[PDB]
Each structure stands twice: as structure tokens, then as C-alpha cells.
Design an enzyme around this catalytic site. Structure first.
Site, PDB file in Angstrom:
ATOM      1  N   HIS A  68       0.816  -1.240   0.000  1.00 43.08           N
ATOM      2  CA  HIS A  68       0.000   0.000   0.000  1.00 43.08           C
ATOM      3  C   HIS A  68       0.842   1.280   0.000  1.00 43.08           C
ATOM      4  O   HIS A  68       0.660   2.153   0.834  1.00 43.08           O
ATOM      5  CB  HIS A  68      -1.007  -0.036   1.137  1.00 43.08           C
ATOM      6  CG  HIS A  68      -2.035  -1.097   0.961  1.00 43.08           C
ATOM      7  ND1 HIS A  68      -1.955  -2.281   1.618  1.00 43.08           N
ATOM      8  CD2 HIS A  68      -3.140  -1.149   0.180  1.00 43.08           C
ATOM      9  CE1 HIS A  68      -3.013  -2.996   1.293  1.00 43.08           C
ATOM     10  NE2 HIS A  68      -3.740  -2.325   0.428  1.00 43.08           N
ATOM     11  N   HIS A 106      -6.244   7.116  -3.159  1.00 41.08           N
ATOM     12  CA  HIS A 106      -7.227   6.216  -2.477  1.00 41.08           C
ATOM     13  C   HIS A 106      -6.624   5.448  -1.292  1.00 41.08           C
ATOM     14  O   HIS A 106      -7.427   4.958  -0.465  1.00 41.08           O
ATOM     15  CB  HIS A 106      -7.910   5.254  -3.422  1.00 41.08           C
ATOM     16  CG  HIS A 106      -7.051   4.066  -3.711  1.00 41.08           C
ATOM     17  ND1 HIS A 106      -5.905   4.173  -4.435  1.00 41.08           N
ATOM     18  CD2 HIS A 106      -7.137   2.791  -3.293  1.00 41.08           C
ATOM     19  CE1 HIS A 106      -5.350   2.963  -4.526  1.00 41.08           C
ATOM     20  NE2 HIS A 106      -6.041   2.114  -3.784  1.00 41.08           N
TER      21      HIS A 106
END
Ligand SMILES: Cc1ncc(C(F)(F)F)c2nc(CCc3nc(N4CCCC4)nn3C)nn12
Ligand SMILES: [Mg+2]
Ligand SMILES: [Zn+2]
Length: 313
Positions: A68, A106
Site C-alpha cells: 500500500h 485512495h
């Protein structure tokens, strides 16, 4: 004004395909993103100076976790670019503007842990946001960065356009909570099949943009097998650290997060492609037929995971 971002020839041709890999040279990722905004939106969508400063503040707020990370952000944005360029005429100007920014933003300030671990650890973010904990955080970080001096890439918009685009980004970022995907895809499946699906209904648009977000977010399963397989190692490097942390709190993690179940990885992938990925890209392909190469590539990677289990890979 007279300034176009360009890319070397192999990148200029291959960036248009769904299965493009943005490469290992970090310093090219900003230029790749600006390239994609310029072609999907126009050289006029954003003041270059503001966009560049926005991209760099976004980059600086992604953490150096195995999966991530900033490379995931630009990857998820490239799949959105491919979807938008193959369905040019289905999307508003605000949508084109909004969705590439949403994708870049996001997973802002992701820590490499699931909503579930924050809730078990009792992280302050889980008291502030009881559901979709990291996703409400990601949108909150997006608004922060937009409000820094010289960072409002949306400053040219009307009050009402500004409010619509921030609303598109909010809903797009919330939709990346996979807990919400299952119900969203079910409703879309039923609406497509009963022929109730209406792209003039704002609440239908929302659901369709939500499914695009899930498709872009999962796009490691749509890449050339070596990319797919090597991304899966980053994904598990995070999940297994989370498993270790669960055990530290005295909680047996789920098998997905337990490094002791390394050997079940092939079957865990099959479950994931069957329960999540294939349905995601199927429904998306029904609703937006030019996205079929994502479903065709997902099915090829499922069959590569089948080969690994059979001992042929
Ligand atoms: C490739 C990919 N992209 C995105 C995501 C995510 F959803 F998380 F974004 C994702 N999750 C997983 C993990 C799949 C998975 N492994 C397992 N175990 C069971 C025991 C061995 C492995 N059970 N399951 C369901 N892979 N993966
Ligand atoms: Mg996320
Ligand atoms: Zn993500």
C-alpha cells in the site's frame, strides 16, 4: 501552455493497454501520472504548477510499506486511465478529473494494516471512523493536501462543480473498502440482468464508479504473470506482518495473514480470484464491454495459479 508531457516510445504505446506495468523507476511515476491526466482530461484540466505540487505532497504522504505504497497508487490510477480511455464518451468532465485523483489518493497514509487490525488494536482512527476506517482516513488526507497553499488543483471549478468532484472522490475512495464491494457488485449484477441499470440515475453511476474502483484497486491480478506473482509476494509481506501483530495482541489471525500457512498461498489465490476478482471483472465487462481485457487477463492469472498448484509452474 504549448507543453505536452511525452514518454519514450515503448511507454507511449504500452501505457494505453490495461496490463501496463509502470516500472521500477520511481522518478518516472509523476510524469506517467501527468501524461495520463493530459490525455484523459486535457492539458487544461489542471494548472501544471498546482498539479505537480499536489502529486509530490501525495507521494510524500504514502508510506514505505511493501504493498500500500506510492507505486500501488500510480498503478491503480493507470488502470482507471485505461478504463476511461476505452469508454471515452460515458463519463463527464468532472468524472475524468475526479477519478484519476481519487485513484492516486485512495490509500493515502496507509500503514500496511487492515481496518480489522486497527479495530482490534483500538487505534484512534477506529474511534473516529467506526466503518471503512482507513478509507475515511484516505479521503480526509486527500482534503488536507487539497487545502495546502498552492495545492488546490480544483480552484478553477465553480462552488458546485468543486462540491460535486469532492463528492465523486469521496464515494470513489469509500468504494475501495472491499467489505462494501460484495453488495455493490450484487446490486449491479441484478440491475444489469433485470435491465433496470440506468447511467442517468446518479445513484447507479455511483455504483458503477464504485465497481471501477474495485477493478482498478485489484488490477495486480490483470498483469503479466511475473508482475502478478511478484506483487502477490508484497501483498503477503503486509498480511503476514499483520498476522504477527494479531498474535502479539493474543489473537490467532485468519489464515490469509498467517505466515505459518505460506504453503496454502496457491489455494488462497484461487479462492480470491473465484470469490472476488473474476466476479468483479465479469460484472464490469457486462456493464462496460471495452474492459474485457481485464477479465481475460484475470482468467489467465487464475489458470497460472492453477498451474502452480498442479506443480507445472
Ligand atoms: C492478489 C490480491 N490482490 C488484492 C487483494 C486484496 F483484497 F486484499 F486487496 C488480495 N488479497 C489476497 C489474499 C487472498 C487469499 N490468500 C488466502 N490465504 C489463505 C491461506 C493462504 C493464503 N486467503 N485468501 C482469500 N490476494 N490479493
Ligand atoms: Mg485501501
Ligand atoms: Zn488500494
Amino acid at each position: 501552455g504549448l507543453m505536452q508531457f511525452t514518454l519514450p516510445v515503448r511507454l507511449c504505446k504500452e501505457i494505453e493497454l490495461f496490463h501496463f506495468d509502470i516500472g521500477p523507476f520511481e522518478n518516472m511515476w509523476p510524469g506517467i501520472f501527468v501524461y495520463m491526466v493530459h490525455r484523459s482530461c486535457g492539458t487544461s484540466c489542471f494548472e501544471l504548477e498546482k498539479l505537480c505540487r499536489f502529486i509530490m505532497s501525495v507521494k510524500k504522504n504514502y508510506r514505505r510499506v511493501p504493498y500500500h505504497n506510492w507505486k500501488h497508487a500510480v498503478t491503480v490510477a493507470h488502470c482507471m486511465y485505461a478504463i476511461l480511455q476505452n469508454n471515452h464518451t460515458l463519463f463527464t468532465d468532472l468524472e475524468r478529473k475526479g477519478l484519476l485523483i481519487a485513484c492516486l489518493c485512495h490509500d493515502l497514509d496507509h500503514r500496511g494494516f487492515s481496518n480489522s487490525y486497527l479495530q482490534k488494536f483500538d487505534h484512534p482512527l477506529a474511534a473516529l471512523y467506526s466503518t471503512s476506517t482507513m478509507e475515511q482516513h484516505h479521503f480526509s488526507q486527500t482534503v488536507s493536501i487539497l487545502q495546502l497553499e498552492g495545492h488546490n488543483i480544483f480552484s478553477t471549478l465553480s462552488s458546485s462543480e468543486y462540491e460535486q468532484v469532492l463528492e465523486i472522490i469521496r464515494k470513489a475512495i469509500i468504494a475501495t473498502d472491499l467489505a462494501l464491494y460484495f453488495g455493490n457488485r450484487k446490486q449491479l449484477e441484478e440491475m444489469y440482468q433485470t435491465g433496470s441499470l440506468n447511467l442517468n440515475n446518479q445513484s447507479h453511476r455511483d455504483r458503477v464508479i464504485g465497481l471501477m474502483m474495485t477493478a482498478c484497486d485489484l488490477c495486480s491480478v490483470t498483469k503479466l504473470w511475473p508482475v502478478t506473482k511478484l506483487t502477490a509476494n508484497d501483498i503477503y509481506a503486509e498480511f503476514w506482518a499483520e498476522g504477527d501483530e494479531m498474535k502479539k495482541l493474543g489473537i490467532q489471525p485468519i489464515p490469509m495473514m498467517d505466515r505459518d500457512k505460506k504453503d496454502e498461498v496457491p489455494q488462497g489465490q484461487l479462492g480470491f480470484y473465484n470469490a472476488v476478482a473474476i466476479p468483479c471483472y465479469t460484472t464490469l465487462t457486462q456493464i462496460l464491454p471495452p474492459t474485457e481485457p481485464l477479465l481475460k487477463a484475470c482468467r489467465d492469472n487464475l489458470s497460472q495459479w492453477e498451474k502452480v498448484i498442479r506443480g507445472e509452474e
